[PDB]
């Protein structure tokens, strides 16, 4: 059984960044051959050149898929910080794998504004590597509890993107698939 890497990249819909989708690939040969012959603008890697992976047997391969802005792609690299790196998708400094990204302006955007994608903008503390919270509880900035009412000094954390086809590249939606390598003997 070759690996289901086709159905990860060609999925109709990708998850939002505050609630990214973790797929587990195992018990299957993996033709990373396509991984190096696509025209996926960022096939960046951190420690494992794509050439040796087809000679390595990995116990588990995890594919984390989500949609972010073009100017947020750099926050997916290890060692980076920012609103995405710290509050949505935290990747460890000791990262083994590759980050693949491509423009999806014709897929994930509409004229009226695509608001189906939402990221976290406020949180009490920064995230640890590979963890995520999907809590929508009201964030209090001030000295007085609002008990769920978003009044002054209380905010709804999960803000939303509004992707539109005419935005500049940095504000266009990008589909990101992070392949983390921890049963999967590549040919």
């Amino acid at each position, epitope marked *: *059984n070759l690996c289901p890497f086709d*159905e990860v990249f060609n*999925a109709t819909t990708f998850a939002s960044v505050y609630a990214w989708n973790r797929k587990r690939i195992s018990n299957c040969v993996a033709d990373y051959s396509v991984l190096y012959n696509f025209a996926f603008f960022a096939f960046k890697c951190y420690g494992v050149s794509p050439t040796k992976l087809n000679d390595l047997c990995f116990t588990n391969v995890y594919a984390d898929s989500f949609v972010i802005r073009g100017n947020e792609v750099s926050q997916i690299a290890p060692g980076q910080t920012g609103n995405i790196a710290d509050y949505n998708y935290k990747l460890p400094d000791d990262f083994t794998g590759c980050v693949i990204a491509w423009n999806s302006n014709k897929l994930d955007s509409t004229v009226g504004g695509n608001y189906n994608y939402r990221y976290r903008l406020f949180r009490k503390s920064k995230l640890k590597p590979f963890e995520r919270d999907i809590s929508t509880e009201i964030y209090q900035a001030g000295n007085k509890p609002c008990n769920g009412v978003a009044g002054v000094n209380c905010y709804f954390p999960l803000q939303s993107y509004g992707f539109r086809p005419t935005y500049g590249v940095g504000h266009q939606p990008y589909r990101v698939v992070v392949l983390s390598f921890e049963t999967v003997c590549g040919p």
Partner: antibody
Amino acid sequence: VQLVQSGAEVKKPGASVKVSCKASGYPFTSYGISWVRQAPGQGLEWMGWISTYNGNTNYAQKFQGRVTMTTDTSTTTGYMELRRLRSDDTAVYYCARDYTRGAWFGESLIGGFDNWGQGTLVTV
Amino acid sequence: IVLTQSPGTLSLSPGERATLSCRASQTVSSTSLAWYQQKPGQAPRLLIYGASSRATGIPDRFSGSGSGTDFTLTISRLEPEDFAVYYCQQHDTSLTFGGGTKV
């Protein structure tokens, strides 16, 4: 990549028909199998989809109960078995290889029906 | 969702442009729509997928586009071999085909 279906059959009302489909030229367990149907003078009518890996099946709304789908990996052959044939069940049942749903995760894909067989005519 | 195609019989002279439409009763994903072409006496083939992406092996005279509830297919120059029956499909919800049109 080819799909080869069985020959035509004639059945009486109330009988069941089992239509086979032979697939070759590609990794069997990487793609699902779908069964659209076209009756004389009509357009196409989806009957259902079956995974070749997990065995999961997704049926069209008005075929649930009669249609039954199965695959055999060792001989890379699919099967479809409609049941309680009615007079309206006369048509040509096509075997198709799909790229509309993932075979392993069951998630919807961007694609269509890549390869169609010659069509099996069932008379009733 | 219910798909309706028009005109039912877009039979025009070869060498000219032929445009088909497919309307949806509900908004559908632009990546979940496809077009098929069925020649007389045989099985249909995938022509376009993902609304606009051309299927492999298909001539570049075929082009698709659309969004929302209004999708179209255009042939830049109709050939003698293009006088076939075309169908639109969506698989955003379940899977359904349109009525089909004859060119």
